[PDB]
Amino acid sequence: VKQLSSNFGAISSVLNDILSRLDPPEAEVQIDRLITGRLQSLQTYVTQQLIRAAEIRASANLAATKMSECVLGQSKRVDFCGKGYHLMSFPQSAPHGVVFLHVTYVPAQEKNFTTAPAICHDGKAHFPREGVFVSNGTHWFVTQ
Amino acid sequence: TTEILPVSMTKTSVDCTMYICGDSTECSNLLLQYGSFCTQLNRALTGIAVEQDKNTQEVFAQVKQIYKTPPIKDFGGFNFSQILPDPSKPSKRSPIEDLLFNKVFNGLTVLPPLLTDEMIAQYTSALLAGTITSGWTFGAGPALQIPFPMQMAYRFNGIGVTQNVLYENQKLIANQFNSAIGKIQDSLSSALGKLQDVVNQNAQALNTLVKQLSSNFGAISSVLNDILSRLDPPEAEVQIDRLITGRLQSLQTYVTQQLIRAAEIRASANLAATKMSECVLGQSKRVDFCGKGYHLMSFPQSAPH
Amino acid sequence: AYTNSFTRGVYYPDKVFRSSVLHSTQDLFLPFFSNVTWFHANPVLPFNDGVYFASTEKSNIIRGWIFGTTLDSKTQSLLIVNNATNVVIKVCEFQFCNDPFLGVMESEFRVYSSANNCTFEYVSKNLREFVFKNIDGYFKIYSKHTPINLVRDLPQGFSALEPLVDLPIGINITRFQTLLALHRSAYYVGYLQPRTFLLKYNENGTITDAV
Amino acid sequence: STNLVKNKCVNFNFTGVLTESNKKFLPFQQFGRDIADTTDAVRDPQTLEILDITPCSFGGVSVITPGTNTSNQVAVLYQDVNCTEVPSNVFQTRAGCLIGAEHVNNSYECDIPIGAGICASYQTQSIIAYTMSLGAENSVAYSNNSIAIPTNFTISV
Amino acid sequence: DCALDPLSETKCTLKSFTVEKGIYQTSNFRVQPTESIVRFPNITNLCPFGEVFNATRFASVYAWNRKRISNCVADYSVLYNSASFSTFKCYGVSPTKLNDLCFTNVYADSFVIRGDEVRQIAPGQTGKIADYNYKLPDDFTGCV
């Protein structure tokens, strides 16, 4: 809008100032200047709107994928639906967008123990089915 | 295998008046009639200059602490000396990183990246030290230290194969990994066209912008000291305005094409971020997302941009 | 006989200094690999769009060249003479003979018999390339004195003719001949063509290579 | 007019600082030029020597403020300009010259980005500058056969 | 007042009274390029204008003699202040500052015409003079 008050090398910025104190033959040469200017500015606006729309589009596409994969799923992907281990998500709207609440599980309060991949017994090697072999300092124990 | 991903390009700033007028009041006074084209141009160039840094921070800054490796290094068969930071090297970089950075005027200014090459190298050293010692635990909270053989048994379980297969084949998997990292050095030395292309594109665009300052566009000369030193102000306006329109057009074209290139560097940086999250901060079951085959682990190394 | 130039007659369009760049220009340049008329020591040759003149000789046989329209009186004629002393340039209506030359005692000078209406008057092995050109009455001569290891044969290599004299007289040159020293006690003729040349320069400003 | 004004951005009638050179020439060269017809040198018309015509000194000016709702103090960066030709605290940065901010030796998280590793903050009274912190530092207890296991936990959103 | 301090200039750039935290380009710094000096070798002479101007006689438009009057001080300031010539028609260049303007070579097409045939000679407009006697090309860069 603020471009509508520039001469661009014209003699006013009003078309009721160029037909106006000037005469129709010389009026073309001052109207065309205004026309070129205003066309340029309108084109620039439209190109920049295309360039901004291309980015709102990528944002919306990520929003779509994540609603597929975090509300409507549980995601094993690392750092796609929060930080930690993904449990669930909830969407909430926002004026021109969406916010999501990421519910994740975070482990805490570690304790260092000793291990080994394997246990020998009766001449055989045993490996844990779904855990790890830890020791309390004496007896060996399987944990998740 | 390797893969090259451009994350940033050069941040440039143009002084509209200094590119079109070149310190001449007559031109500067004629330029004011065009309104705020020069303001919209500076805005657009600042708007891409800032996002170039944002790309960098969203790719590399995925760690809270600066992890360091133990001084005594026994990884049960894996020797990672070619990808660890070397103290006697420039910028405390890794041997592989060394090879990567060896392979690849008038209102015109280039802004330095907020982040130096040293700090990117330290981000990588942190990520690397975290993955070789704690596995994927540091990417979900506490860095629980695990023996490297145990970590490799879990990634084997992750691809469906039993742990005994790694435990009875430790020394061979060891040698094959070492030999496969041995070929990377030579394969890269004999590769980073992705990176070379973005630099070449930005260079050619700057070069065309400067070369446009020697065209008349329908004027009598290309110098403002050849229309003010050779003609009275009345008739000079009808020749300066010609140079003005043409230089505005060329500047606008450059900025539009820079916005279009920035949109594509953004997409590349976003895929680098997602992949760092899925392939070094975790193990991807995604077919062909972190390599060809069954993904085991990834390791980031830095390249100029 | 005819011969084949390889990369010859590549003069500096003009002055300003240029460091190692590939400035592409477009001037009257003898096209790369042209057909140079091999002469031996002569008849009047046309001037047309400039004349390339490679001279391969040790003893001074080429004793200057005559230039002009009718190469005689009624119309002015640019005579460039070279003697045991120095160069005598003269644009006057002369009386050039059918064979304008000089003898070698040292009794010489038979070129002409008259010298009326004298507007311009100036007075003062080894391959000698020369480029003549009268654009807008400006006789820009270009020269390259590069010592060869042959006798009278065109060598293979590159040479950047450095601009020499420019005569602002304004004479119609449509023909030209060669003054030679006779005995009392081989040159090459090419024609320049509008040619686009990617001129590769050096940090010292020298055209080291061209395309 | 006068004689050679070596090393001065001057308007010459043979603008730019009249630095000198040591290049050669071929007996005729008039002035000097380079890529995109940029007058980068000249066969000096009088003493027949080479002088490099470097364009005049120039650069953007950036204003760092902690916000008018916190303070009205301001810091100024002259972009990629040597801090000796600007016209307290003057501090030289790979990104130009910074005036109005004192350089400290701590490292914090980045607040206002200057560049080349440098950020600025309204902390230490006045504007201060520093090399930003990548982060804190966690060490590890790796041996060859020792594991850590979490005992309690936390749900986060 | 947009020229007091950096903060006021920042306010003026943003067109606001509350600036939030960030970093804002505000203006440019340009070292003064003054002391205009002349290294041009002075010609220190005088171009004989009157000789090729108002002489004893002139030529016709069929045999106009172009006199090369150059390599001297071209004082056109004295021609302008004398104003003894009805027309000056400087097409291509400025005739007021033609004295200081330094060219490489200047001509002097000397001929006489009628008062109606003085308009005929023109860069573009053809006629009994500019198409049959003395033709003035459109690249005219001198002064009639």
CB B63, CB B300: distance < 8 Å: no
Q: Which residues pair with A121 in a beta bridge?
A: A124
Q: Return the residue matching tokens 């011969």.
A: C3
What's the one-letter identity of residue E7? L
Query: Which chain B residues are Cβ-neighbours of A43 within 8 angstroms?
Result: none
CB contact under 8 A, E33 and B232: no
Across the interface, whether the CB atoms of E25 and B46 are under 8 A apart is answered yes
Which residues of A are less than 8 Å from B136 in CB distance? Answer: 78
Beta sheet of D96-99, edge-to-edge order: D90-93, D96-99, D75-79, D58-65, E22-30
Establish whether chain D is in contact with chain C, requiring a minimum of 3 CB pairs below 8 angstroms. Answer: yes
Exposure string over D40-62, b if 16+ CB within 10 A, otherwise e: bbbbbeeeeebbbbebbbbbbbb
By a Cβ cutoff of 8 Å, what residues of chain E touch chain B? 25, 28, 30, 33, 93-94, 96-97, 101
Which tokens hold the place of A28?
């073309």
- Cα–Cα distance between D105 and D126 in angstroms, integer? 15
* D15's tokens: 């603008």
CA of D36 to nearest chain E CA: how many angstroms apart?
23
Terminal Cα distance for chain D, rounded: 77
Work out whether strand D10-13 and strand E34-38 pair parallel, antiparallel, or are unpaired.
parallel
SS3 state at B91: helix
SS3 B298: coil
Q: Which residue of B has its CA nearest to A125?
A: B164
Resolution of the coordinates, Å = 3.7
Beta-bridge partner residues of A120: A125
Cβ distance of E39 and D12 shorter than 8 Å: yes
Q: Of A8, A84, A110, which has the smallest distance from its Cβ to B140's Cβ?
A: A84
Give the C-alpha separation, C67 to C78, whole Å: 5
Q: Select from D14, D22, D26, D51 the residue whose CB has the most chain C CBs within 10 Å, as the one to mutate to test that interface.
A: D26
Residue A1 near chain B (CB below 8 Å): no
| CA proximity to C127, closest of C180, C56, C26 | C56
Contact B174, B161 (CB under 8 A): no
Mutate to test the interface with D, among E35, E44, E104 (most CBs of D within 10 A): E35
D98-117 core/surface letters (b: 16 or more CB in 10 A; e: else): bbbbbeeeeeeebbbbbbeb
Gaps in chain A (C to N distance exceeding 2.5 A) after: none
Of the candidates C159, C154, C160, C157, the one whose C-alpha atom is nearest the C-alpha of residue C186 is C154
Q: How far, in Å, CA of C159 to CA of C144, rounded?
A: 7
Domain ranges of chain C: 2-211
Q: Could you give the C-alpha distances from B188 to B88, B93, B98, B197, D5, in angstroms and in order?
A: 22, 16, 11, 17, 52
* Residues in chain B within 8 Å Cβ distance of A37: 34-35
Across the interface, whether the CB atoms of B13 and E25 are under 8 A apart is answered yes
For residue A84, list chain D residues with Cβ-Cβ distance below 8 A: 156
* D65 reaches E (C-beta below 8 A): yes
End-to-end Cα spacing for chain C: 27
Judging contacts by C-beta atoms under 8 Å, the chain B residues touching residue D146 are 145, 147
Per-window interface: D 125-154 vs C, CB < 8 A: none
Tell me the C-alpha distance between B8 and B28, whole Å: 35
Q: Long-range contact list for B155-163, CB < 8 A, 24+ apart?
A: B155/B283, B155/B296, B155/B297, B158/B283, B158/B285, B159/B294, B159/B295, B159/B296, B162/A127, B163/A117, B163/A127
Nearest to B94 by CA among B126, B70, B116: B126
Tokens of C56: 């391969």
Q: Which value, in Å, is the radius of gyration of the alpha carbons in chain C?
A: 17
The backbone torsions φ and ψ at residue A30, rounded to the nearest 5 degrees and listed phi first, read -100, -30
CA distances from C134 to B274, C49, C166, E101, E109 (A): 70, 8, 9, 27, 21
Rounded to the nearest angstrom, the gap between the alpha carbon of residue C103 and the centroid of all alpha carbons in its chain is 22
Q: How far apart are CA E141 and CA A127, in angstroms?
A: 98
Q: Which residue of E has its CA nearest to B45?
A: E25
Q: Could you write out the DSSP letters of every residue in D58-85?
A: EEEEEEEES-TTT----EEEEET--TTS
**Angle, CA D27 vertex, CA D21 and CA D32 arms, to 5°:** 40
From D114, which residue of chain B is nearest by alpha-carbon distance? Answer: B114
User: Please, are residues B155 and B295 in contact by the beta-carbon 8 Å criterion?
Assistant: no
- Do B26 and B235 form a contact (C-beta atoms < 8 A)? no
Among E124, E74, E116, E132, CA closest to E98: E74
**Cα–Cα distance measured from residue A134 to residue A129, given in angstroms and rounded to the nearest whole number:** 14
**Contact in structure between B72 and D144 (CB atoms under 8 Å):** no
Interface test with A, best of D142, D151, D156 (most A CBs within 10 A): D156
**CA-CA distance, E124 to C49, in Å (whole number)?**
29
- CA separation for the pair B241, B224 (Å, rounded): 11
Neighbours of C35 (CB within 10 A): 12
Q: Answer whether E46's CB lies under 8 Å from E72's CB.
A: yes
Q: Locate tokens 């290891």: which residue?
A: C149
Shortest CB distance from E94 goes to which of B18, B42, B231?
A: B231
What is the radius of gyration, based on Cα positions, of chain A? 35
CA–CA separation, B60 vs B119, rounded Å? 10
Residue of E10, E12, E13, E25 to mutate, interface with B, max B Cβ within 10 Å: E25
Q: Which among E18, E23, E30 has the least Cβ separation from residue D113?
A: E23
DSSP string, A43-107: HHHHHHHHHHHHHHHHHHHHHHHHIIIIISS---STTSSSSSEEEEEEEEEETTEEEEEEEEEEE
Query: If you write DSSP's letter for every residue of B223-267 in order, what string do you get?
Result: -GGGTSSSS-HHHHHHHHHHHHHHHHHHHHHHHHHHHHHHHHHHH
- Spatial neighbors of B8 by CB under 8 A, at least 6 apart, are B52, B53, B55, B56, B113, B265, B269, B305
DSSP single-letter state for residue B24: -
Whether B164 sits inside 8 A of A3 (CB atoms) is no
DSSP code at position B173: H
Q: Is D9 on the interface with E (CB under 8 A)?
A: yes
Interface B-E: count of C-beta contacts within 8 A: 18
Q: Across the interface, which of A106, A112, A113 has its CB nearest the CB of D154?
A: A106
Total number of residues shown for chain C: 211
Residue D124: other Cβ atoms inside 10 A: 12
**Any CB–CB contact under 8 A between D38 and chain C?**
no
CATH number of C2-211: 2.60.120.960
Give A89 to chain D, closest Cα distance, Å: 9
Q: List residues bridging with C138 in a β-sheet.
A: C135
**Residue (of B180, B143, B86, B135) closest to B280 by Cα position:** B135
> Out of E7, E23, E29, whose CB is closest to D68?
E7
One-letter identity of residue A12: S
- Closest CB from E19, E21, E23 relative to D62: E23
Q: What angle do CA B215, B220, B226 make, to 5 degrees?
A: 90
Residues in chain B after which the backbone breaks (C–N beyond 2.5 Å):
104, 190
Which residue, chain included where needed, has tokens 């296991």? D149
Q: Among A90, A94, A95, A96, which Cα is nearest to A56's?
A: A96
Indicate the length of chain D as a whole number.
157
CB contact under 8 A, E25 and B42: yes
Q: Which residues contact C158 (CB under 8 A, 6 or more apart)?
A: C7, C8, C10, C207, C208, C209, C210
Q: What angle do CA B196, B202, B207 make, to 5 degrees?
A: 120
Give the span between the Cα atoms of B155 and B161, in whole angstroms.
9
Most A CBs within 10 A among B27, B29, B33, hence the mutation to make, goes to B33
Nearest alpha carbon to residue C90 among C68, C110, C106, C107 = C68
Q: Strands C51-57 and D17-18, how do they pair?
A: unpaired
Looking at beta carbons, which residues of chain A come within 8 Å of D154? 105-108
Q: Is B13 helix (H, G, I), strand (E, B) or coil?
A: strand
Experiment type: cryo-EM
Q: Are E121 and E86 in contact (CB under 8 A)?
A: no
Contact D29 C15 (CB under 8 A): yes
Task: Measure D49 CA to nearest chain B CA, in Å.
Answer: 24
End-to-end CA distance of chain B: 20
Which one-letter amino acid corresponds to residue A24?
A: P
The conformation of residue B280, written as its DSSP 8-state character, comes to: I
Query: Which of B23, B70, B107 lies at the smallest CB-CB distance from D140?
Result: B70
The answer, yes or no, to whether C and A have at least 3 beta-carbon pairs within 8 Å is no
SS3 D24: coil
Q: Does A12 touch chain B (CB under 8 A)?
A: no
Please state, in angstroms and rounded to a whole number, the distance separating the CA atoms of residues B233 and B11. 38
Residues in chain A: 144
Q: Which two structure tokens, joined as six digits, stand for C85?
A: 């002393």
Q: Provide the number of CB pairs (under 8 Å) joining chain B to chain D.
A: 99
The residue type found at B99 is L
Other beta carbons within 10 angstroms of residue C186's beta carbon come to 17
Q: Which residues from chain A sit within 8 angstroms of residue B149, using beta carbons? A: 117
Mark whether D and B touch (3+ CB pairs within 8 Å).
Answer: yes
Token pair 């070698």 in the structure block, residue: C104
Write down which chains contact chain B via at least 3 CB pairs under 8 A.
A, D, E
Structure tokens at B186: 């030579």
Say if strands D41-43 and D127-131 run parallel, antiparallel, or are unpaired: unpaired
DSSP one-letter code for C171: -
Spatial CA neighbour of C130 closest among C62, C206, C73? C62
Q: Do the Cβ atoms of A79 and B139 come closer than 8 Å?
A: yes
State the DSSP H helix or E strand holding residue B27, giving kind and residue range, or none if neither. helix B25-31
DSSP calls for chain E: -TTSSHHHHHHHHHTSS-PPSEEEEEEEEE---EEEEE-SPP--S---HHHHSS-S----TTS-EE----SS---HHHHHHH--SS---EEBS-STTTTT---S----EE----SSHHHH--SS--SSSTTTS----TT--EE-
Residues D141, A110: C-beta atoms closer than 8 Å: no
A contact residues 29-48, partner B, Cβ 8 Å cutoff: 37, 40-41, 44, 47-48
Between positions 115 and 144 of D, the ones with CB within 8 A of E are none
Contacts of B192 (CB under 8 A, 6+ apart): B4, B100, B103, B104, B303
* Nearest by Cα to C41 from C132, C111, C107, C102: C102
Q: Using CA atoms, how far apart are residues B192 and B104, in angstroms rounded to an integer? A: 7
Residues A16, A22, A28, A33: is their CA dihedral positive or negative? negative
Q: B13: which chain D residues are within 8 Å (Cβ-Cβ)? A: 60, 79
Question: How many Å is the Cα radius of gyration of chain E?
Answer: 26
Rg, Å, chain D Cα set: 27
Positive or negative: CA dihedral E70, E76, E79, E83: positive
